Every structure is written in structure tokens, then in C-alpha cells.
Amino acid sequence: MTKALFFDIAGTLVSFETHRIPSSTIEALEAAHAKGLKIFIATGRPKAIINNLSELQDRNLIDGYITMNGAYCFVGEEVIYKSAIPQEEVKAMAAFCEKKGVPCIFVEEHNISVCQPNEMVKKIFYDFLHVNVIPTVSFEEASNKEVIQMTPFITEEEEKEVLPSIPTCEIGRWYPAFADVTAKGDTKQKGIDEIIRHFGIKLEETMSFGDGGNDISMLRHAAIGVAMGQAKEDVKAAADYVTAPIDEDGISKAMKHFGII
């Protein structure tokens, strides 16, 4: 039976339309918590810019976090796994973005920065996703940092152009305007593995929930993967079950369907 739930944030817990968590989702997670489910966040975002979970956090419903696509995992105050990108690949991404004229976010363990933020950062991270403004630093400074995750604002075409300079990183994408880059093997699947290792939970007792391309590995890896109803077809194909759209009680309906609650 399911013992661990893994939830993506954007488009899974938090609506892109309201920037809020559906009421039925909060109710479902309260019910699951009381039944003893462990409830985990599994997001591409770094902790520093997770600014939209307060309704769950204030209710003390989250048992641990997979952040940065698996590159930074923690349970309470305890870090259980982290990674860093090979410096050559940080440098190559910085040089590429600066040459191309596109911005890039560089995330360290305890600092976050953006280089040359432009209309794409404003449009996508601030205006669309409601991320708080990230401090600016130069690409030269960024290129020298110990970086856990980079988020270049590159298209799929631009990604293929920089790819040979990025020979070992993982590149996770759910949206056409940016991708998240982490070190080899660091995907939300890795995050699941680290969390369940910590808790003594078997992979066969896991359930994941996602809407995006960066969820596909965790949708396949968990024993049961649930795709949100508005997800792209490749995300749905990776899942075992497709629930309703997020703003049509998709989380609650899935949890009820499986008897989680």
C-alpha cells in the first residue's frame, strides 16, 4: 500500500490560474496526513524561491522536501542529499547564455542569483509564476560559484546548441522558455530514492503526482504515477493514471480513487 506521496508544486499543487492551492487539495492532504501518509514536495524549484506553499506549511503537513529536481533534499532541518554541477559545465552554460543574450539563474546552497535578467525572466518567473525578484550578479561571478542548479532561459533549440558543452548534466523541462540543469543523475527520481531511504519506505509503496516534463522520471519510477489532467501527452503517457485538471479537484479525486483517503 502507499506510504509516501510525492507532489510537484507548479501545476500540481498550485494552480497557474489562481496562484493558489485548491481547497480540496488542502482537505485531501489533511486527511492523508491523519491516515499516516508521508507527504513530500518534489519540485524543480530551490527552497529560496518556494513562496507559495504556506497553506500546507502552516498546517504542518509536509514531511520532507525534494528541491532542485533532486539535487537538494531535506527532512526538517536535516539535509539528506545534495549535489553540485561540474565547474566546467557551470562555466560553459554561463558563457553560452552571455553570448546568446539570455538570462540564467544560478542556485547555490545558501544564495541564489540571476544574470542579465530580461523580458523572459520578468514574463515567466515574475509575472507568470509569481516568483519574488532574484538578486542580480554578473556572469563572471556566477561562473565561479559552487552551483547546485542552473536555470537558463533557453528554448529547446538553444538547449540543443549548448548540449555538447553540457555533457553530464540532467536537463529538466516542463515549459518552453527555460530549463533546469542539475548534475548527473539528479532528477526527481533520485529525490524519491533519497527520501524513501531515509524513512525505510519501499519504492513499491510510493505515489507521485506531476504535470510536467520534469516529472516524467518520477511518474515512471514511483509505484503509482499520477498525471494532472492538463499535462502534455508525454507526461500523461509516463503516468499510470491521469486525474482531472488541477482546478477540477484533480489531486483529491486521484487520492480518493486509490483509497489513499
Q: Which stretch, 63-71, 147-155, 181-189, 210-218, contacts Mg ion (CB under 5 A)?
A: 210-218
Binder of Mg ion out of 62, 211, 213, 255 (CB under 5 A): 211
Q: Does 212 bind Mg ion (CB under 5 A)?
A: yes
Q: Does 180 bind Mg ion (CB under 5 A)?
A: no
Shortest CB 41 distance to Mg ion, Å:
11
DSSP 121: I
- When the beta carbons of 117 and 212 are compared against Mg ion, the nearer one is 212
Distances (CA, A) of 212 to 56, 186, 228, 234: 21, 16, 9, 9
Site residues for Mg ion, 51-80, by CB under 5 A, read none
Set of cell numbers at residue 78? 536535516
Q: Please name the residues in contact with 172: beta carbons below 8 A apart, sequence gap of 6 or more.
A: 44, 69, 179, 180, 181, 182, 187, 213, 214
Shortest CB 9 distance to Mg ion, Å:
6
Q: Which stretch, 5-13, 62-70, 79-87, 242-250, contacts Mg ion (CB under 5 A)?
A: 5-13
Binder of Mg ion out of 5, 8, 112, 114 (CB under 5 A): 8
- When the beta carbons of 94 and 216 are compared against Mg ion, the nearer one is 216
Phi, psi angles (nearest 5°) of residue 216: -60, -45
Q: Does 172 bind Mg ion (CB under 5 A)?
A: no
Looking from the CA of 23 toward its CB, the CA atoms found within 13 Å total: 0
Type of residue numbered 215: D
- When the beta carbons of 156 and 161 are compared against Mg ion, the nearer one is 156
Type of residue numbered 123: K
Shortest CB 52 distance to Mg ion, Å:
12
Q: Is residue 23 within 8 Å of residue 30, measured between CB atoms?
A: no
**Rounded CA gap, 148 and 146, in Å?**
7
Site residues for Mg ion, 9-38, by CB under 5 A, read 10-11
Looking from the CA of 5 toward its CB, the CA atoms found within 13 Å total: 30
Point out which residues bind Mg ion (CB under 5 A).
8, 10-11, 211-212
